[PDB]
Design an enzyme around this catalytic site. Structure first.
Site, PDB file in Angstrom:
ATOM      1  N   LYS A 116      24.756   7.476  29.405  1.00  0.00           N
ATOM      2  CA  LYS A 116      24.832   6.522  30.538  1.00  0.00           C
ATOM      3  C   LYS A 116      23.608   5.597  30.500  1.00  0.00           C
ATOM      4  O   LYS A 116      23.777   4.394  30.778  1.00  0.00           O
ATOM      5  CB  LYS A 116      25.051   7.269  31.857  1.00  0.00           C
ATOM      6  CG  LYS A 116      26.504   7.654  32.128  1.00  0.00           C
ATOM      7  CD  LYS A 116      26.649   8.869  33.034  1.00  0.00           C
ATOM      8  CE  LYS A 116      28.015   8.999  33.685  1.00  0.00           C
ATOM      9  NZ  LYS A 116      29.112   9.016  32.686  1.00  0.00           N
ATOM     10  N   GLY A 166      31.164  13.059  38.564  1.00  0.00           N
ATOM     11  CA  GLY A 166      30.394  13.238  39.812  1.00  0.00           C
ATOM     12  C   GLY A 166      29.430  14.414  39.757  1.00  0.00           C
ATOM     13  O   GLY A 166      28.571  14.503  40.654  1.00  0.00           O
ATOM     14  N   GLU A 201      19.440   4.867  40.323  1.00  0.00           N
ATOM     15  CA  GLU A 201      20.117   3.639  40.807  1.00  0.00           C
ATOM     16  C   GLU A 201      19.904   3.533  42.317  1.00  0.00           C
ATOM     17  O   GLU A 201      19.660   4.563  42.955  1.00  0.00           O
ATOM     18  CB  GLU A 201      21.618   3.683  40.507  1.00  0.00           C
ATOM     19  CG  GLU A 201      21.966   3.542  39.031  1.00  0.00           C
ATOM     20  CD  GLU A 201      23.453   3.603  38.726  1.00  0.00           C
ATOM     21  OE1 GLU A 201      23.848   3.152  37.609  1.00  0.00           O
ATOM     22  OE2 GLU A 201      24.208   4.090  39.597  1.00  0.00           O
ATOM     23  N   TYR A 203      21.490   3.505  45.769  1.00  0.00           N
ATOM     24  CA  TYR A 203      22.718   4.171  46.269  1.00  0.00           C
ATOM     25  C   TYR A 203      23.455   3.197  47.187  1.00  0.00           C
ATOM     26  O   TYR A 203      22.892   2.803  48.229  1.00  0.00           O
ATOM     27  CB  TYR A 203      22.412   5.469  47.019  1.00  0.00           C
ATOM     28  CG  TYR A 203      23.650   6.227  47.417  1.00  0.00           C
ATOM     29  CD1 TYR A 203      24.555   6.648  46.453  1.00  0.00           C
ATOM     30  CD2 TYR A 203      23.939   6.499  48.746  1.00  0.00           C
ATOM     31  CE1 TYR A 203      25.710   7.334  46.792  1.00  0.00           C
ATOM     32  CE2 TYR A 203      25.091   7.188  49.102  1.00  0.00           C
ATOM     33  CZ  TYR A 203      25.973   7.610  48.121  1.00  0.00           C
ATOM     34  OH  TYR A 203      27.111   8.287  48.440  1.00  0.00           O
ATOM     35  N   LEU A 204      24.671   2.817  46.811  1.00  0.00           N
ATOM     36  CA  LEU A 204      25.544   1.962  47.658  1.00  0.00           C
ATOM     37  C   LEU A 204      26.363   2.870  48.578  1.00  0.00           C
ATOM     38  O   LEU A 204      27.023   3.823  48.081  1.00  0.00           O
ATOM     39  CB  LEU A 204      26.412   1.073  46.767  1.00  0.00           C
ATOM     40  CG  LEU A 204      25.609   0.242  45.771  1.00  0.00           C
ATOM     41  CD1 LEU A 204      26.513  -0.622  44.917  1.00  0.00           C
ATOM     42  CD2 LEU A 204      24.563  -0.587  46.494  1.00  0.00           C
ATOM     43  N   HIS A 209      35.665   1.379  44.377  1.00  0.00           N
ATOM     44  CA  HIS A 209      35.672   1.719  42.935  1.00  0.00           C
ATOM     45  C   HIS A 209      36.683   0.803  42.252  1.00  0.00           C
ATOM     46  O   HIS A 209      37.912   1.010  42.451  1.00  0.00           O
ATOM     47  CB  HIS A 209      35.939   3.211  42.756  1.00  0.00           C
ATOM     48  CG  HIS A 209      35.607   3.742  41.400  1.00  0.00           C
ATOM     49  ND1 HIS A 209      36.035   4.969  40.979  1.00  0.00           N
ATOM     50  CD2 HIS A 209      34.859   3.240  40.389  1.00  0.00           C
ATOM     51  CE1 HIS A 209      35.577   5.202  39.762  1.00  0.00           C
ATOM     52  NE2 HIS A 209      34.862   4.154  39.371  1.00  0.00           N
ATOM     53  N   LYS A 238      40.659  10.844  41.724  1.00  0.00           N
ATOM     54  CA  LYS A 238      41.540   9.711  42.125  1.00  0.00           C
ATOM     55  C   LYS A 238      42.891  10.263  42.615  1.00  0.00           C
ATOM     56  O   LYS A 238      43.376  11.245  42.036  1.00  0.00           O
ATOM     57  CB  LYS A 238      41.675   8.747  40.948  1.00  0.00           C
ATOM     58  CG  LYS A 238      40.382   8.049  40.571  1.00  0.00           C
ATOM     59  CD  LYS A 238      40.494   7.284  39.297  1.00  0.00           C
ATOM     60  CE  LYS A 238      39.177   6.686  38.877  1.00  0.00           C
ATOM     61  NZ  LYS A 238      39.166   6.372  37.436  1.00  0.00           N
ATOM     62  N   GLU A 288      29.610   2.782  34.516  1.00  0.00           N
ATOM     63  CA  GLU A 288      29.949   3.465  33.245  1.00  0.00           C
ATOM     64  C   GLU A 288      31.239   2.911  32.628  1.00  0.00           C
ATOM     65  O   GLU A 288      32.024   2.218  33.317  1.00  0.00           O
ATOM     66  CB  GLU A 288      30.072   4.973  33.457  1.00  0.00           C
ATOM     67  CG  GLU A 288      31.174   5.382  34.413  1.00  0.00           C
ATOM     68  CD  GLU A 288      31.028   6.831  34.861  1.00  0.00           C
ATOM     69  OE1 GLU A 288      31.636   7.704  34.222  1.00  0.00           O
ATOM     70  OE2 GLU A 288      30.268   7.086  35.835  1.00  0.00           O
ATOM     71  N   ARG A 292      38.520   4.965  25.985  1.00  0.00           N
ATOM     72  CA  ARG A 292      39.809   5.698  25.898  1.00  0.00           C
ATOM     73  C   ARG A 292      40.811   5.035  26.845  1.00  0.00           C
ATOM     74  O   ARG A 292      40.392   4.249  27.733  1.00  0.00           O
ATOM     75  CB  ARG A 292      39.638   7.176  26.282  1.00  0.00           C
ATOM     76  CG  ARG A 292      39.296   7.402  27.751  1.00  0.00           C
ATOM     77  CD  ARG A 292      39.304   8.855  28.162  1.00  0.00           C
ATOM     78  NE  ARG A 292      38.513   9.128  29.354  1.00  0.00           N
ATOM     79  CZ  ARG A 292      38.916   8.912  30.602  1.00  0.00           C
ATOM     80  NH1 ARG A 292      40.112   8.426  30.848  1.00  0.00           N
ATOM     81  NH2 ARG A 292      38.123   9.191  31.612  1.00  0.00           N
TER      82      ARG A 292
END
Ligand SMILES: NC[C@@H]1CCN(c2nc3nc(N)ncc3cc2-c2c(Cl)cccc2Cl)C1
Ligand SMILES: NC[C@@H]1CCN(c2nc3nc(N)ncc3cc2-c2c(Cl)cccc2Cl)C1
Lengths: 446, 446
Positions: A116, A166, A201, A203-204, A209, A238, A288, A292
């Protein structure tokens, strides 16, 4: 065109790949665990090889058994689907070294984007907007770690460089928690990924998404196929995805799409891929890249008319992209409901025998599933048994068709999330559109 | 002499072998993939057989198709070149069982040297200096593994016995990492080679990579043809090779050469071979042996006058070595720059159509390539499209000629490392000579 391929996967995605192969006149080899002898795609495949017993470690993750099946059947290529070995760089390398075509990117590209920290550095260099962050791994100098949090502005989030799904993430809301949060994220990353590297990072709090589909031939051509909103989710799974994303204008789509296509050229990307973004207050921030095909690829197919699996097979056969960017047109709207063998309230997995099955039909209704009446959903694998995709000339028509299709879908003998999906389609906030990543957890918490 | 041989390879090495065959009046059979119909050597060969489609598994690794092509043409021998099946003991055995000559050592010798543990034991027994190590495979007793690391002294390196090309290897700097390092090297070896055997060596921090060329015939003669320095490399890909190695005296050359020749007699070696050494603080340490002609063989040819491919063919026909050890004289200096179709920023292969081509010329300039104007570099095979080899009466003149030849080399239509090679020839540390295996990664990191 590829003479013959191994489908190194199972369930719905193995069947999806089988259909693309048959349309192109490509011979199929279905490799399966001993528990998956009765998968629909195995029963339809030109040749079958049992590559081991039920557990994935012995079958679908067993690199020597898969390569051996590809050798003895005379296959020339391997499609890894999603999950399993699809982002395993060593596998991609071994497939190429054993003289097969890998239906996916170069192994070095999988390594670059699966780390990442190195992936963010590549994207920032390419001109893709990223989250304000460390722009590098954190050291053990807590003066410098505090200075990065100050520049970014609390709250911040610590992530594992080898992380994903996550797992290996910690939100920090002030300095008092920063030292212990970094230490604990390191320890968790080392124990899970044998890689203690972490980054920071901003944080939002309430993002959507939103992800961009790309195709690149590895020959210098790259295109974007609009975006998907994947915000309707629970515990990093999801549940509903849609294309396009509500509230995204053509000017915004073009802005972020062009930066993703240009990034593909810069990193020599080959095949299908997805750029994942946080979208908040009209701004995109890269988190990220998936190297694939993804579960939710069908909503992009419905609104563009592009068959993403067939393009993967053409690209792997060495064909340049035939589709130019100016020929890609967003038309109408598509919604995907994931169908999972799990309790709609407790989410306890529900493997077992399907005693009665009926698929929905109609204009704009697409059913992606291996399941049939008498089929046993095995306890050894994922809970996702099917995908219901509804298309309309607008979002309201797509949702109306999904409500009707969910009402026709019969799956008896196991628990499914069909009743949850019906609740989501009836939700006024979903019907308005634009709910954030936390919405479904909040609705279910009430 | 051999009436007729199959060239079981492609690209520059297939053309190199074709020239050696024509000089000796040997008829050539060019076996090729359907993507390689227009290779220069295929267009020059006496006979051609298309052995399968583009992917290597169905063409250049396709054992039945290659043997069948030798049968149908009435060929008597197969030259495997480098890569593909050249180190495949089962292939060599099948070739001999089918009644064809394999241009290489006995199958049993290929198996001995492809097992890094068994090869080290044989070399140590013959009097060749080796790296301090386990002198045997590591078991699962971590008390014994810690005791071996202590006796050797940290840092140590774990290596696969079935290993190759730097894959799997893990450096260990203390006990805390030893168990996980051994376990991960095993799992990687099992998945790649179906052989989980691993060993331990003292890790040398800043060695040079120095290799000894040998020839042995079936009449009992074995000679050494000095050394090559292969230290200028990136991620286990050689970029520049030279002969002789800078700073190696005649007394050192003779010392290590004699031990390599004596080892050849002890093990009944036949054909061309290379002994790979780490060279550090004036000492040699054997790591492994290649039982095949190598990419970088031309630098040895330029400084000895010996045509190594013709020697391979004479040896296989049953002729003695054309020279004795006292007739082998190191004269002058040669440098080889590998020319790759690669992207300068990603280092991924950059295949495609060459639109304009011009080869360099002049005194001491040797160009080894199949490429021509209009030739398409296919995606299916490795990125190396040519080799530029420059000879001078000393190292400075060899480097001067290489800079001039690199400036004449035109390859338009595809990305190449020509500009990187020019930068390496202008590097003050390279001009001084003796840089270690880590130098090029350090220069590029800056
Ligand atoms: N592939 C998405 C990984 C896993 C979840 N994730 C998030 N990263 C984030 N990184 C910052 N700086 N800010 C907010 C983030 C919110 C999420 C998130 C969460 Cl927590 C749940 C569901 C979906 C998403 Cl995208 C990264
Ligand atoms: N063919 C050489 C294989 C791959 C590289 N190699 C090395 N082995 C080693 N074994 C010990 N004990 N110590 C140091 C070694 C350093 C290397 C090495 C590396 Cl890492 C990169 C480039 C060239 C070389 Cl020679 C073994």
């Amino acid at each position: 065109m590829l003479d013959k391929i191994v489908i190194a996967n199972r369930g719905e995605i193995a069947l999806r790949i089988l259909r693309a192969c048959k349309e192109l006149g490509i011979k199929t080899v279905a490799v399966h665990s001993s528990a998956d002898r009765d998968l629909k795609h195995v029963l339809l495949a030109d040749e079958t090889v049992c590559i081991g017993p039920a557990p994935s470690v012995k079958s679908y993750l067993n690199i020597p058994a898969i390569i051996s099946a590809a050798e003895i059947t005379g296959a020339v290529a391997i499609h890894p689907g999603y999950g399993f070995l699809s982002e395993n760089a060593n596998f991609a390398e071994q497939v190429e070294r054993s003289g097969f075509i890998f239906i996916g990117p170069k192994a070095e590209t999988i390594r670059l984007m699966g780390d990442k920290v190195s992936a963010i550095a590549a994207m920032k260099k390419a001109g893709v907007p990223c989250v304000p962050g460390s722009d590098g791994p954190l050291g053990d100098d807590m003066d410098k770690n505090r200075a990065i949090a100050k520049r970014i502005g609390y709250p911040v989030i610590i992530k594992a460089s080898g992380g994903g799904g996550g797992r290996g993430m910690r939100v920090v809301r002030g300095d008092a928690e920063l030292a212990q949060s970094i230490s604990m994220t390191r320890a968790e990353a080392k124990a899970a990924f044998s890689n203690d590297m972490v980054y920071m990072e901003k944080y939002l709090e309430n993002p959507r998404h939103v992800e961009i589909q790309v195709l690149a031939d590895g020959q210098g051509n790259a295109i974007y196929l609009a975006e998907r909103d994947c915000s309707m989710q629970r515990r990093h799974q999801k549940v509903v995805e849609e294309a396009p994303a509500p509230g995204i204008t053509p000017e915004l789509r073009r802005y972020i799409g062009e930066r993703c296509a240009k990034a593909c050229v810069d990193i020599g990307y080959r095949g299908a891929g997805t750029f994942e973004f946080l979208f908040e207050n009209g701004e995109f921030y890269f988190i990220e890249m998936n190297t694939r095909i993804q579960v939710e690829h069908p909503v992009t197919e419905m609104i563009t008319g592009v068959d993403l699996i067939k393009e993967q097979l053409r690209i792997a056969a060495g064909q340049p992209l035939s589709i130019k960017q100016e020929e890609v047109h967003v038309r109408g709207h598509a919604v995907e409901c994931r169908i999972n063998a799990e309790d709609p309230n407790t989410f306890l997995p529900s493997p077992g025998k399907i005693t009665r099955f009926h698929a929905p039909g109609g204009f704009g209704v697409r059913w992606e599933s291996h399941i049939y009446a008498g089929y046993t959903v095995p306890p050894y694998y994922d809970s996702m048994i099917g995908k219901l995709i509804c298309y309309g000339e607008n979002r309201d028509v797509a949702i109306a068709r999904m409500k009707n299709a969910l009402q026709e879908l019969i799956i008896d003998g196991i628990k499914t999330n069909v009743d949850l999906q019906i609740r989501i389609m009836n939700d006024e906030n979903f019907q308005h559109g634009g709910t954030n990543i936390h919405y479904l957890e909040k609705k279910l918490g009430l």
